[PDB]
Write a protein that binds this ligand. Structure first.
Ligand code: HEM
Ligand code: HEM
Ligand SMILES: C[C@H](O)[C@H](O)[C@H]1CNC2=NC(N)=NC(=O)C2=N1
Ligand SMILES: C[C@H](O)[C@H](O)[C@H]1CNc2nc(N)[nH]c(=O)c2N1
Ligand SMILES: [Zn+2]
Lengths: 420, 420
């Protein structure tokens, strides 16, 4: 009982059976589709008070094992039986189990593939897995994070990597990075109420400030890392500036663009999500890829609740800023995006334009239906926030479902954290 | 219970209660969201062979009367309940019922209001309803439609209007327009293998040629209306040229845009949908509004399966069309859309840009929540094909659901027509 989906631009169709393996968690019903909801609690894995009862954990562990051994081109039936026995007992003995280093590598790459809002999934097999499950202290987390950052930054030739911290035990000893991103700029509410820097980051910058960080009141101040080790209250650590590559924004025809004095960091890294694997939850697993120009050019720079430079750019381009119908906003957003693309390239830092990205995703999607008869995808997030129908993705019908392993959101740590 | 949704670019939130009155017909399960499917069977109201079982009909009939009568600030229980009585008898006796003139006006507007994929809904209360439920012939249908086209074109000052043809009886005497739109250009499969005109219309165009129309082999040849009266084989009727307002495409600065020799028609009218009202189905109800610039500039002119002029425009613009990262496709699509809105304005024909349209939709969405505690909306359809996040609609979370009255899809007539 597959579900046929079609691409109205190429006529290509896929039959989807994989969604049958999905968890019955989405909130859509016959009466209503809630697909445009950003952070549904269906895509959220929140805080635990007790450890997962072992009996409850057993079935999911075996399923992951079966899934792990199932990825084997050349089946290891014997190794497979062994491992299933090993896990059953380990859970029987320790109430939990540890993934081998290879099962973790597999689990990380698979959760990326099962990430329906990620357009960069064609690179799913190129992922550096930093095993940091041995971790015990906030300082150690800091060092693992700087290693990751130096690795992935790689002097501009950005590389993907994930750092997996210790798995959740009882939920009272979680290893989590409170930051949404590893690198992110601060936002400050000035004494008169106005905001300087990234307005989306005002709340968290205050937390940092409340924890001892010295505010610098600039437009682009990298906030410090707020690390929670072993469920202890978090500690601040500042990424050494030499590990933070940044790009100054210039525009290939507009000399004055440089006067805007804009820049953005090279490393996109999600730090506050939870990796789910065979029943196990990993509350700390920062991961990164490289940038899709539109994230900076359209969202970071043009969202009204972010940097909001559209008005000022339209004005400098000499556009009919007074009427919507002149499409000045659309001319501005394109030039800003050309700037972003042009600047990273100039400085030799990895960045992909939304067209090449979408074309790579179509390729990935086809490979997925070919290999596993399915590819969970969220149309709303995959389609670029600029030139939608100009991309193949816009014209692609998709199915959105949650498989396993999966990268879930969590409740923001400060919201749940009991300070001691 | 309600469902709270929020706009991330304004902070406004709504609490949806209306969704409970929606029809449980969406195919989204907990295990899968297929909201990106374009023509789902859940949104399709197909053919019949028997009349609607009166037992099934009656409740939907009553519900409608209640809704209708409930729509007055000044209530009238006497009149209301009597109309419930009347409709009961009618269905009991006749096995069906007939709406009043005012009820039909209410149903059409209310169905428009309940049209999730419509960004134009703020205008929902301004709709001219051409009653033609007495219609009996193909020429008569053609005459009602010519009246409709003339009223709506209004010399460029476009007006919204719907023409309701007789309600379906037993499914064997459906009054229907086979064409998707009232006005649309033809697509020809040329001998050298190329396609001339609108490629998306090659199939319907061949159908017309098969029914006896003389193909003109031009790029913008209006196809003949293919009209089915009382279930009879369809009959062709070409709309008087003088009744077809068109706009020659020109760009405000690019003098060579005229060399492209493009033009488009001013009246957009969905000709093949089904109006559902209290159990009643009206397979023929052509409606129209005015154009949102993007439909023509991004979709009709830029889809690769349509006119696909992106490449030559980019070339004419002197862009690095060989490099996707140059964002040449983005610069070209912006100028194409500026030509569109410029040309319509210059020729004094009604058209609305996507920022202005998106803005009005937000105004409408709020009124709706204040009014009925709901507003079914399809995010995927409502977000313009270009510059998505620059518009407030992108940042708006929505609930998509099916209410009554409602405009559904139908299986294309030819796929089901038994030629007598
Ligand atoms: C290989 C280069 C990569 C590119 C270009 C890329 C690009 C993107 C983009 C453009 C988004 C949309 C997010 C937004 O707009 O907020 C996204 C989301 C996401 N990416 Fe990828 N990504 C890459 C690698 C990765 C890796 C390695 C992982 C996990 C190991 C990953 C996991 C995710 C997840 C989980 C989301 C959803 C985030 C959310 O819910 O906010 N990505 N990515
Ligand atoms: C008042 C000016 C109007 C504007 C600017 C407008 C604009 C639009 C746009 C841009 C779409 C998306 C279509 C696409 O891209 O395929 C749409 C869809 C739709 N409109 Fe509106 N519209 C208007 C009036 C109306 C009226 C008066 C009705 C009904 C009497 C209506 C019913 C619909 C329906 C049912 C759809 C869904 C079409 C489909 O499923 O293909 N619209 N409209
Ligand atoms: C596959 C995908 O659902 C389709 O390409 C959709 C996307 N959104 C859309 N939106 C609008 N307004 N018209 C379309 O034809 C359309 N096509
Ligand atoms: C409300 C709506 O779901 C929200 O604006 C979404 C739309 N699509 C998106 N897509 C991406 N990639 N990133 C986002 O933050 C969003 N936001
Ligand atoms: Zn859904």
């Amino acid at each position: 009982r597959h579900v046929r989906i079609k691409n109205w631009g190429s006529g290509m169709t896929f039959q989807d059976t994989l969604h049958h393996k999905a968890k019955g968690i989405l909130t859509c019903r016959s009466k209503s589709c809630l697909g445009s909801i950003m952070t549904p609690k269906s895509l959220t894995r929140g805080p635990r008070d007790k450890p997962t009862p072992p009996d409850e954990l057993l079935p999911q562990a075996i399923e992951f094992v079966n899934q792990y051994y199932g990825s084997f081109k050349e089946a290891k039936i014997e190794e497979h039986l062994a491992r299933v026995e090993a896990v059953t007992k380990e859970i029987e003995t320790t109430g939990t189990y540890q993934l081998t280093g290879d099962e973790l590598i597999f689990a990380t790459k698979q959760a990326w593939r099962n990430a329906p809002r990620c357009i960069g999934r064609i690179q799913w097999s190129n992922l550096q897995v930093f095993d940091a499950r041995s971790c015990s202290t906030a300082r150690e987390m800091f060092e693992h994070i700087c290693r990751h950052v130096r690795y992935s930054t790689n002097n501009g030739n950005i590389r993907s990597a994930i750092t997996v911290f210790p798995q959740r035990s009882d939920g009272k000893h979680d290893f989590r990075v409170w930051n949404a991103q590893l690198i992110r700029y601060a936002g400050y509410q000035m004494p008169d109420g106005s905001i300087r820097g990234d307005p989306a980051n005002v709340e968290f910058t205050q937390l940092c400030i409340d924890l001892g960080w010295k505010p610098k009141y600039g437009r682009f101040d990298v906030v410090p890392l707020v690390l929670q080790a072993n469920g202890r209250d978090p500690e601040l650590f500042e990424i050494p500036p030499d590990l933070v590559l940044e790009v100054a924004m210039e525009h290939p025809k507009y000399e004055w663009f440089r006067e805007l004095e804009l820049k953005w960091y090279a490393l996109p890294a999600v730090a506050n999500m939870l990796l789910e694997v065979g029943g196990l939850e990993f509350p700390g697993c920062p991961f990164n890829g490289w940038y899709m120009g539109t994230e900076i050019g359209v969202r970071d720079f043009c969202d009204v609740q972010r940097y909001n430079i559209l008005e000022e750019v339209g004005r400098r381009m000499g556009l009919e800023t007074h009427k919507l119908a002149s499409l000045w906003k659309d001319q501005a957003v394109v030039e800003i995006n050309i700037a972003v693309i042009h600047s990273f390239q100039k400085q030799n830092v990895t960045i992909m334009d939304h067209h090449s990205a979408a074309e790579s995703f179509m390729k990935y999607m086809q490979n997925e239906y070919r290999s596993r008869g399915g590819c969970p995808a969220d149309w709303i997030w995959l389609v670029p926030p600029m030139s939608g129908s100009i991309t193949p993705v816009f014209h692609q019908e998709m199915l959105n479902y949650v498989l396993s392993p999966f990268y879930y959101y969590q409740v923001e740590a400060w919201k749940t954290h009991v300070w001691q």
